[PDB]
Each structure stands twice: as structure tokens, then as C-alpha cells.
């Protein structure tokens, strides 16, 4: 049993860690271009915020599935019940 | 130490002589120009140019133009 | 004694607990201290934190009392530079009229700076003098207050209470809950809005809870690493070897000079983030 | 490391300190700076009043 | 039994974690250029939105395959039957 | 028997996962310049769109071999017959 | 107990190491653009500053969930209870 | 034979996975410059498209060797013949 | 017990290493833009330098949380107590 | 001997896969600049194409050494001899 | 005993190798902008050089902590004393 | 020396593989700027080519030491002699 | 003893392998802006060349420490003496 | 462990740090407040010259 439970602890760290790494870099790129556009055209700021959020919805789609499944593997375990 | 600077218009000159530093509102952000700067051609914004001269200071309003 | 024992001793606080023997009791070993519940207090951490707060208040109040109006006194000149620097930092970050942000920011900056300042003296000077004065050669004792997570958490939780209070005070309870559920995603129809309220809460609540947790750990990390790196450098001289001691003194000086940047930056950054976080509890960004 | 009620004592001291300094540390110094501001401003206006 | 079951948690974590990392970084690069284009020509934004969604389909295509195989490896695991 | 089945589950995760990671980043780069070009030259978008699909065929070429071999290894394992 | 506990030190180190990796690179991207905007437009600094702090909370959100679950695996253990 | 066979599946997954990762990122870089050139000078497209295929031959050269060695290790095995 | 001690040494190294990697690449991005902004106009170098130190507090935050927990693992050990 | 063989299958996969990854990304950067130069100066293409092949000889120099050693470890084996 | 001794030699390679990787890329990012800015304003070089060395001390801050903990682990050993 | 011999095959793959990866990406960046400069001002090619070879010496300096050590561990072996 | 020596060969490959990877990418980022500065300011290339060597010493500071320790581990292994 | 030698070595480092402080760190910050002290006197005097 202990190898399945121990490998599940690493699976959870791998699910959340890669999603944290990806979203932090993704928002550095997206938000960096929002500040660039806001600096050149300060009149466009109220419109651009809305457009940035559209992309943020696509950027967080898979990461939320990943952290949701990671929490599921800590409070429940579909592998431990299969041995 | 001192760079030659001339403010010129289609109708007449506005300023001339040597200067220490020039501050101009360029098309993509403001610029601080000093003696020895690299070749730059840039459209200016409607706004003022501040010319530092060996220490005294000069200011002139301009309505647009090209900074070479 | 082994070096593992010296490091293990330095990494222990002076905990006070109600042991059955009598009304007042103190922990005598690391395990016995770890067995005490949350309802115990670190005598050393609190002692240094209240003392340095009173020392700062006393040197500032002695000057505030003798306000020359015109030309300032030698100490008053420094106090005014600090008041002007904080007022400038506040006016540049926050445009409201609340009188509580500037006194809070000055307190946060000068207090945290002094809590960190006691780390520059040799790490075992104070513990040895405290042990000799108390009459116990094996007393646990730590001078630097910010190397205890509990001290940094007390600062951030105190700031977070003010962030939630002002947000509710100006936006109203229904408005505050509204910002946590109606933004940033919104729609022209209720059938779509009900699908967006969990997404809005999932974004706002996570980004709200990260402020008090990051503030504490941001301050604790650099300082705890600073104290422990000084302890590791302190062990180098314990060998008695000439070339290894020569390396130790050179590393101690280089690390101490580098730490003059860290002590200043952590106090300044906690102040700026305090001002920034409070200023966004009086404004709206959707 | 070990979790304790130590944060309470420091936070309680800080809340009382934050309320105290706002009434006994900031007001004397900000007033002493506002006086000089007013003196510099009215002193410069005095020259404009004399010139008029 | 336990090694196959335990290594399938790592396989699921890699299928979703690597996909999440790529999709988050990919949209940061794509959306960043969309905001630059929207700031430059605000009259073309309705057209740039539909063109962005054409690319979004290509960008997430293999990621959707990987999260569909990871939810297949999680419920009714195909490797348990082979042993 | 179990080690080959355990290691082949991770081999399938490397094939789909590294392919998903690379193609999601690749289309973020390719698509970012497609939207920038379309925002710069609104009348050229029907010409740039066909050129993007010619490049999409090169970008996903090796990735399609990765997912193809991964699905082959999942259902008709060629390594389990060599022990 | 020895394998589950020794593999939890590696889990904790991947949760805070990948979070530290991504947020330091992300704030280098976001901040590198804030400093350029502050240089291009001296009068926009207070507006660009408040807009940077909106994105900064989005950038570290998932990393802080990983720093927080890592601290939980360091002073408590949901796996060891799984004996 | 069991460990040599189990490690051959990972070896194949690395050969095709690292090849797919590099080729997808490589065409994202080369492709973005082709679209930038096509937008700047639409008369140059016939020339730029031929020069892109000359570069595509250099870019995929080692990736195709990796896919070939991976297919060789899939339908045959030089390690298993050594016991 | 030796597996717990040995995997804690790798935990310390991943926790300090991925943080040193993130801090060095993150400040190379932030610092590079600070020098470019300083080159645009030297009168604002002191203002920009003050703004850089404010962002350094966001960038080097989680990297120091890892250095703090790692230095708590180089001598003390909360995992040994768990047996 | 079975370990000495099985680890050479992974050695070959790293040695060819990391070479394929670097060469595929490297030509995307070099080739993208060749298309940019060719669009700017069509009359200089005969010279730029020859200069690209000078750089291509340096870019692949170490990758071809890696492929040569990887084929050497595949058809011969200086490790199986235990020499 | 031997497992801790062997895994700490690799812990020293991760501490110095990940610090070497980050410091070499971080100075390529910071120094590339220092040479670009020095070409822009050759009369301001003395000022930009001091601002560059101030940031250089921020890059080699966590890397020197890791190069100092990694030399501690080669000439002394905090894990071996724990048995 | 199965352990010493085996793990040495991996060591050689890491030495040449990481060196090939860095050298191929490094020349993609250096060479991309050489073609840009050659297209910007064609009369500077005689100087720019010599300046590229000066940088190429610094770029490959550590990679060539890594390849030298990798061929030393392949035909000779210090680890097998130490026992 | 073999596990200490075998893992030491991998520690050595990680020390110089990650150093080669970071210095080659770092000199491509640094050298790429040097050629651009030389193309924009050809008469100033002697100054730009001198300014570049100040960054080269800082870029190679931690990487040469890794190379020195790697040679030390190969000819005077400090872990074999730890029983 | 030579505890006494550690106290002396650390005391030497602390003395060198204070020597370095008096040589470079301390002179500018103590003088800046004294220059501010002069600037305040000169400003208010100028306002009083205008008042006369």
C-alpha cells in the first residue's frame, strides 16, 4: 500500500506545481502586454481590462481542472481503493 | 560636454547654439538627449521641450515636429 | 559539545506554560516546549518586540514633545525626515483623507527596522549575557523577533484586520460580498451571472487570502536565513584552526555588510505593501 | 517551526500602539511642518504683496 | 498490483500537468499579441477576437486529448486488465 | 510482468505530454504573430490565414507521431511480447 | 513509514521550488514592463502602479495555494495517516 | 530481459517526446518570422515560402533521425539481442 | 530512517535550487528593463530605482520562503518526528 | 550485465533527444532571422543564404558529435565489455 | 550510511549547477540590455555601469548562499552525523 | 563495476546532451542577430563576422570542456580505477 | 561503495552540464546585443567590446566554481572518505 | 569548541564593520541631516527677509 500512497503525494505536488509554474509565467506575459497597452493608450484601459479577462478564462481552464483533481487525490483516493 | 541644438520651423528659427541636455515628448515615450547620443529620427508629441544649457535652463512650447 | 547541539540550542525559544507544579512555569527542553499547546507564549520574542516599540516611541515622543516650530533639534530633524518620507510615500500611493494610514506606516517601518537591527550584533553575545544574568547556563534565548513566524504573522494579521474593516466600512457588507462574487466576470443576464459567481469567488478569495500569508513569510524568510547563516558562520571559528577562522571573519563581515541592504529592504517593502493594500480597500477596479 | 499564542501579545500591543502614535506622535510633528509650510508660503506671498 | 496502480497516478499527473503548463504559457503568448493588436487598431477588435478563437482551437487540441486520456486512466484504468 | 506495464504507462505520458507542451507553446508563438499581422493589415487576413494552416502542418507533424505511437502502446503494446 | 516520509520531503521541495521558480520569473516579466511604462510615461506611474498590483495577485494565487499545502505537509501529514 | 524492455519504452518516449517538443517550438519561431515577412512585403511570399522549406529541412533533420531510431527500437531491439 | 534523511537532502537542494534559478532569471528580466528605462532619460533613474525595489518584494518573496524552510531542514527535521 | 545494457538505451535517448531539442529550437531562431533579413533586402539573399550555412555548421557541431556517440553505443558497446 | 553519502554528492551538483544555470542566463539578460543602453547613451556609461553592478549583487545573492551550502556539504557533512 | 560503469553511460549522455542543447540554442540567438546586422548594413559583414567568431569562442568554451570530459570517461575511466 | 562513486559521476555531469547549458544561452543573449550595438554604432565597437568583458566575468562567476568542484570530485572525491 | 575564540573572531568582524561604517556608511547620512538643518534655516530666513 505505502508505494501507492507515497506516489500519490508526489502526483499531487506534480499536478499543482506545474499549474502554478504555468499560470505565473502566463500572467507575466499577458499582464506585461496589458501594462504596455495601458501606458500608450490610457483611454483604452476600461475596454482592455475586459479583453484581458477573456484570455484569463482560457489561461486558467486546464489549471483549475488540475488543482481540483489534486485536492481530490488528497481528501479521497481512487488508486488506494483499486488494489 | 556640449551638443549643438537648433529649434527650426518652416517659417523661421526658434532657438540655436550649444546645450548640455534636451528633454522631448517623443511619439513612444519621453526622451532625455545628451551629447554623443546614437543616430535617432523620431516624431514628437505636441508638448514642451526643455533645454538644459551648461548648469541656465530654457523652455519652448511646440505644436509637433520631428526630432533628429 | 558537538556543533549540531549548538545549532539545535540556538533554534529554540523561551516558552512560558502552566505546568501543574504552580501558576507560572517555563519550558526546560525542546521536546517539553513542543509538547506545550498553542496557549503558551515566547517570553524572549515578546520581550524584544515590546521593548523596541517603547524605545522607538520614547525617542520619537521626546522630540514630538519639544516641537521647535522653526529650526528643528538634532534628533527632531531625523524624526521630521521620517514623517516627511512616509507622508510622501503615502500621498504618492493613496489619495484619500483617512488619518490612520501614515501613523500605521511609520510605526510598521521604524518598528520592523529596529526588530531587525538587533541581528547585526554577534549571535551569542545576548544569549550568554541573558544566561549569566538569569543564573542558568543552559537557558534558551533568541534576540531577533522577526525570525519567529508568529511575530511576522502577528504583524500581517493585524494589517489584514484593518484591510477587511476599511473595505466593509466604505463598500458596506453587501457591497464587500458583492466584490468577492460579482467581479471580475459579469454578464447582461442572470442565467450566466449564476454560472460566474463561483468563478469570481475562486479568483477574489484566493487573491485576498494570499495577502496576509505572503506578508508574514516574506518578512520571516530573509531574516531567519540571515540569523541561521550567521550561526553557521559562528560555528566556523569554533574549530580553533587559523586558516578556517580567517575565512570565518571575512565571511562574517561580507554577510553583515550585505545584510545592511536586506534589513532596510524588508522593512521598506512591508511598509509599501501595507500602504498599497490599505489604499485598494478605498477604491474600485472591477 | 512551533505555533504559539505569542502573535496575540505582539498584535494587541501593536493595535494599541497604532492608535496611540496617531494622537501623540504624528499630530505634533505634522503641525510643526504645516506651520513652516504656511510661513514659507505667506513669506513668498509677502514679497508679491510688496511688489503689487 | 500496487506498482501499476501507483505509477498510473504519476501518468495522470504528467498528462494534465504538462498540458496545463503548455496551455497557460501558450495563451500568455497569444493573448499578449491580441492586446497589442487591439490597442493598435481598436476598430478591428471584433475581427481579431474571431481570429484568436481560430488559433485557440489549434492551441488546446492536443491538450484536450491529454486530459481526456487522463480521465480515462483515472476511472476504469486500462493497465490493470493487462496484468 | 508488472514493471513493463508500469514503465509503459509513463512512456505514453511522455509521448502525449511533451507533445502537448510543445504544440501549445508553438501555436502561442505562431498564432501571436498571425493576430499581429491581421491587426496591422486587416485586408490581408484571408491570405495570412491559409499561410498559417501551411505552417500548422509542419508544427504538428512530429507531435502526431507521438500521440499515434502513444495510442498504439496503450491498446496494442509491442513491448509486453519481448520478455 | 520511512518511504512515505522521505518522499514527502521531495514533494514539499517541488511545491515550493516550482512555485519559487515561476513567481520570480513572472514578476521579472510583469515588473520589467511596469518599469518601461514608468519610463515612457512619467505621469502614468500612479495608474500603472495600481494596475500592476491587480495582476500581481493573479500571478501568485496558485503559487500561494502550493506554498500553503507544502507547509501543511511539513507540520502535519495526510499520507502517514494513510499508513 | 524485463528491465531492458521496460526501459526501452521510456527510451522511445524520450526520443519522440523531446523531438516533438523541439520541432513544435522551432516551427513556432520560424513560422512567426515567415508571417511577419509576408505581412511586411506580400510580393515576396513566393520566395520566402521556398526559403522556409530549405530551413525546415535543416530543422527536422535530427528529429527525423530520432523518430527513426525510436521506430527501430519499437519493431526491433538491439539491447534484447545482448540478453 | 536513512531514506527519510537522504530524501530530505534532495528536498533541501530542490527547494533552494529552483528558487535560486527563479530569482536569477527573474531579476535578469526586471534589471534589464531598468537599465533600458534608465537609458531613455537619466533624470528619472532615482525614481525608477525606487519603483524597482517595490517590485523586488513581489519577485523574491516565494524564493525566500523556500530558503527559510530549506534552512530549517539542513539542521532540524520535522519529518524524523513522524517516524 | 542487464543493468549495463538497459541504462545505455536511456543514455542514447538523452544523447539524441537533447540534441534534437536544441537543434530544432536553434534553427527556429536562426531561420526566423534569415526570413526577416530576406524580406528587408531581397538583393542580399545570395550572400545571406551562404552566411546562414556558416552558422549552421557551428550550431550542429556538438549535436552531430552526440548522434555519432549515440550510434556507437547502439551497434557497439564500450560499457557491456565491463571495460 | 552509503545512500546519504551518495545522494549528497548529487545534492551539491544541483546546488551549484542550478545556480550556475540561473546566474549565466540572468547576466545574459541584464548585460545584453547594458550593452544596448551603452550604445544608446555612450556619455552615461559610468552611471549605467554603477546601476548594473547594484543589480548584479541582487542576482548573485541566493546563488552565493547555495554555493556556500554546497561547499559545506563537500568538506563537512550535516547528514552523515545523523547516521 | 556495474553501478560505476552503468551510471557513467548516463553521465556521458548528460555531459554531451546538455552541452549540445545549450550550444545549439546559444548559436540560434547569436546567429539571429548576425543575420539581422548583415541585412541592416551589408557593408559591415567583414567586421561582424569576425566579432561573431570572438563571441563563439566564449559560447563554446565550457561545452568543449564538457565534451572533452565525456570522451575521457568513455575510453578511459577514473571511477572504475578508484573502486 | 559503488553507489557513492556511481552517483558521484552523475553529480559531476550535472555540475558541468548545467554550467555549459547556462553559459551558452547566456552568451547568446549577451553576444546578440553586442553585434546589434556594433551595427548601430560601428566606431564605438572598441568601447562596446571592453564593456562586454566586464559582464563576461560575472556571467562565468558561479559556472567556473561548478567546473572547479566537478574536477575536484573526479580526481579527489570527498565522499569516498566518509565510510 | 573554542567558545572564547569565536567571541573574539566575531567581535573583530563587528569592529571592522563599525570601522567601515564610520569610514563610508555614517558620514553621508549624518551630514545630509545637517545640510537639511541649514536648508531649513536658509528657507525660513528668506521668508523673514521678505516679511521685513
Q: Which secondary-structure segment (H or E) carries B18?
A: strand B18-19
* Whether F62 contacts H63, CB under 8 Å: yes
Contacts of A63 in chain E (CB under 8 A): 20, 23-24
Nearest to L36 among J4, J33, J78 (CB): J33
CB-CB under 8 Å, A57 with C202: no
Interacting residues of M14 by C-beta distance below 8 A, sequence separation 6+: K10, K13, K14, K17, L14
Give Cα F45 distance to the centre of its chain: 25
What's the CA gap between M6 and L4, in Å, rounded? Answer: 4
Question: In terms of C-beta density within 10 A (0-12 exposed, 13-18 middle, 19 or more buried), how is residue G67 classed?
Answer: buried
- Residue C6 grid coordinates: 549548538
Q: Which secondary-structure segment (H or E) carries F69?
A: helix F61-75
B/e letters for C83-95, b = 16+ CB within 10 Å, e = fewer, are beebbebbeebbe
Residue N22 DSSP code: I
Taking CA atoms, B49 is separated from B62, B67, C257, H49, K44, in Å, by: 7, 11, 43, 47, 21
CA distance N27 to chain D (A): 26
R_g of chain L, CA atoms, integer Å: 18
Interacting residues of A81 by C-beta distance below 8 A, sequence separation 6+: none
Q: Is residue I36 less than 8 Å (CB to CB) from chain B? A: no
Alpha helices in chain C (DSSP H): 3-10, 30-35, 43-65, 74-93, 101-117, 125-134, 149-171, 173-182, 190-237, 242-279
Task: Give the three-state DSSP class for B57.
Answer: strand
The DSSP bridge partners found for residue B31 are B24
Residue ranges of E 14-53 with Cβ closer than 8 A to chain A: 14, 16-25, 27-36, 38-39, 42, 45, 49
Residue G34 DSSP code: H
* Whether E23 contacts E63, CB under 8 Å: yes
* Whether E13 contacts F14, CB under 8 Å: no
Tell which residue, B23, B16, B68, B20, has the closest CA to residue B47.
B23
What's the CA gap between A1 and I10, in Å, rounded? Answer: 24
Contacts of C226 in chain I (CB under 8 A): none
Give the residue from F1, F3, F7 with the most H CB atoms within 10 Å of its CB, the best one to mutate.
F7
Maximal CA-CA distance, chain M: 62
Interacting residues of C254 by C-beta distance below 8 A, sequence separation 6+: none
What values do phi and psi take at B23, rounded to 5? -110, 120
| Beta carbons within 10 angstroms of residue E54's beta carbon | 15
Task: Give the three-state DSSP class for F35.
Answer: helix
* Whether G21 contacts I18, CB under 8 Å: yes
What's the CA gap between G44 and I44, in Å, rounded? Answer: 14
Nearest to F22 among H24, H45, H60 (CB): H24
Give Cα L79 distance to the centre of its chain: 24
Contacts of B30 in chain G (CB under 8 A): 39-42
Taking CA atoms, A8 is separated from A2, A4, E3, G11, in Å, by: 10, 6, 12, 10
Evaluated on CA atoms K81, L4, L7, L8, the torsion sign reads: positive
What's the CA gap between F1 and N49, in Å, rounded? Answer: 100
CA distance C221 to chain I (A): 5
Interacting residues of G70 by C-beta distance below 8 A, sequence separation 6+: A13, G11, G12, G15, G16, G19, I69
Query: Which position among K12, K22, K60, K67 bears the catalytic label?
Result: K60
Task: Give the three-state DSSP class for F56.
Answer: helix
Q: What is the dihedral of CA I12, I15, I17, I18, to 10 degrees?
A: 160
- Residue N8 grid coordinates: 573574539
Helix C190-237 to helix C3-10 angle, to the nearest 10 degrees?
130
What's the CA gap between I28 and K59, in Å, rounded? Answer: 7
Angle, vertex CA N46, rays to CA N44 and CA N47, nearest 5 = 60
Alpha helices in chain G (DSSP H): 2-40, 45-75
What's the CA gap between N47 and N52, in Å, rounded? Answer: 9
Interacting residues of K9 by C-beta distance below 8 A, sequence separation 6+: M4, M7, M8, M11, M73, M79
Do chain L and E touch: 3 or more Cβ pairs under 8 angstroms? Answer: no
Give Cα L51 distance to the centre of its chain: 19
CB-CB under 8 Å, N50 with D44: yes
Contacts of D36 in chain N (CB under 8 A): 40, 43-44
CB-CB under 8 Å, C283 with G67: no
Residue C283 DSSP code: S
| Beta carbons within 10 angstroms of residue C172's beta carbon | 11
What's the CA gap between B12 and J18, in Å, rounded? Answer: 66
- Residue F70 grid coordinates: 502513444
Residue F43 DSSP code: G
- Residue K39 grid coordinates: 550604445
Cell 488540475 identifies what position? A66
User: Chains that contact H by 3+ CB pairs under 8 Å?
Assistant: F, J
What's the CA gap between J60 and J20, in Å, rounded? Answer: 10
| Beta carbons within 10 angstroms of residue C186's beta carbon | 14
Nearest to L25 among M7, M25, M63 (CB): M25
Task: Give the three-state DSSP class for B51.
Answer: strand
Counting Cα atoms < 13 Å in the Cβ hemisphere of J51 gives 29
CB-CB under 8 Å, A16 with G66: yes
What's the CA gap between L17 and L19, in Å, rounded? Answer: 5
Q: Which secondary-structure segment (H or E) carries H1?
A: none
Tell which residue, E38, J66, K48, L74, has the closest CA to residue A46.
E38
What's the CA gap between I47 and F67, in Å, rounded? Answer: 53
Amino acid at each position: 500500500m505505502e508505494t501507492v500512497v507515497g506516489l500519490t503525494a508526489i502526483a499531487v505536488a506534480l499536478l499543482i506545481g506545474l499549474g502554478a509554474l504555468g499560470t505565473a509565467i502566463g500572467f507575466g506575459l499577458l499582464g506585461g502586454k496589458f501594462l504596455e497597452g495601458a501606458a500608450r493608450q490610457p483611454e483604452m484601459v476600461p475596454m482592455l481590462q475586459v479583453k484581458m479577462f477573456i484570455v484569463a478564462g482560457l489561461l486558467d481552464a486546464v489549471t483549475m481542472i488540475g488543482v481540483g483533481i489534486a485536492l481530490f487525490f488528497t481528501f479521497a483516493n481512487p488508486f488506494v481503493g483499486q488494489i | 560636454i556640449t551638443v549643438h541644438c537648433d529649434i527650426v520651423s518652416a517659417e523661421a528659427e526658434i532657438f540655436s547654439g550649444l546645450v548640455e541636455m534636451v528633454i522631448a515628448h517623443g511619439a513612444l515615450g519621453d526622451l532625455g538627449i545628451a551629447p554623443g547620443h546614437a543616430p535617432l529620427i523620431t516624431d514628437l508629441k505636441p508638448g514642451p521641450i526643455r533645454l538644459v544649457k551648461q548648469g541656465e535652463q530654457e523652455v519652448y512650447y511646440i505644436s509637433g515636429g520631428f526630432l533628429e | 559539545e558537538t556543533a549540531s547541539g549548538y545549532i539545535q540550542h540556538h533554534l529554540q525559544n523561551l516558552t512560558f506554560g502552566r505546568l501543574p507544579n504552580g501558576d507560572w512555569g517555563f519550558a526546560h527542553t525542546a521536546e517539553q516546549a513542543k509538547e506545550m499547546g498553542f496557549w503558551a507564549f515566547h517570553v524572549d520574542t515578546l520581550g524584544w518586540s515590546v521593548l523596541l516599540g517603547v524605545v522607538f516611541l520614547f525617542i520619537f515622543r521626546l522630540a514630538a514633545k519639544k516641537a521647535t516650530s522653526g529650526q528643528p533639534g538634532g534628533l527632531q530633524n531625523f524624526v521630521e525626515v521620517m514623517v516627511e518620507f512616509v507622508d510622501t510615500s503615502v500621498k504618492d500611493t493613496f489619495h484619500g483623507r483617512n488619518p490612520l494610514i501614515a501613523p500605521l506606516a511609520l510605526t510598521v517601518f521604524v518598528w520592523i527596522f529596529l526588530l531587525n537591527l538587533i541581528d547585526l550584533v554577534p549571535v551569542d553575545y545576548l544569549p550568554m549575557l541573558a544566561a549569566k544574568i538569569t543564573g542558568d547556563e543552559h537557558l534558551f534565548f533568541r534576540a531577533v523577533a522577526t525570525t519567529d513566524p508568529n511575530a511576522t504573522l502577528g504583524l500581517s494579521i493585524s494589517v489584514f484586520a484593518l484591510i477587511v474593516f476599511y473595505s466593509i466600512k466604505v463598500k458596506g457588507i453587501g457591497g464587500f460580498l458583492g466584490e468577492l462574487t460579482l467581479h471580475p466576470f459579469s454578464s447582461k443576464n442572470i442565467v450566466v451571472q449564476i454560472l460566474l459567481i463561483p468563478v469570481n469567488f475562486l479568483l477574489e478569495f484566493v487573491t485576498l487570502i494570499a495577502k496576509p500569508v505572503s506578508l508574514a513569510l516574506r518578512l520571516f524568510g530573509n531574516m531567519y536565513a540571515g540569523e541561521l547563516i550567521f550561526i553557521l558562520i559562528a560555528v566556523m571559528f569554533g574549530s580553533g584552526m587559523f586558516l578556517l577562522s580567517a575565512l570565518g571573519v571575512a565571511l562574517n563581515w561580507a554577510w553583515a555588510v550585505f545584510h545592511i541592504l536586506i534589513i532596510t529592504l524588508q522593512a521598506f517593502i512591508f511598509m509599501m505593501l501595507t500602504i498599497v493594500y490599505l489604499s485598494m480597500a478605498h477604491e474600485d477596479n472591477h | 517551526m512551533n505555533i504559539n499564542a505569542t502573535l496575540i501579545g505582539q498584535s494587541v500591543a501593536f493595535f494599541i500602539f497604532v492608535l496611540f502614535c496617531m494622537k501623540f506622535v504624528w499630530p505634533p510633528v505634522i503641525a510643526a511642518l504645516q506651520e513652516r509650510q504656511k510661513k514659507i508660503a505667506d513669506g513668498l506671498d509677502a514679497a508679491n504683496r510688496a511688489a503689487r
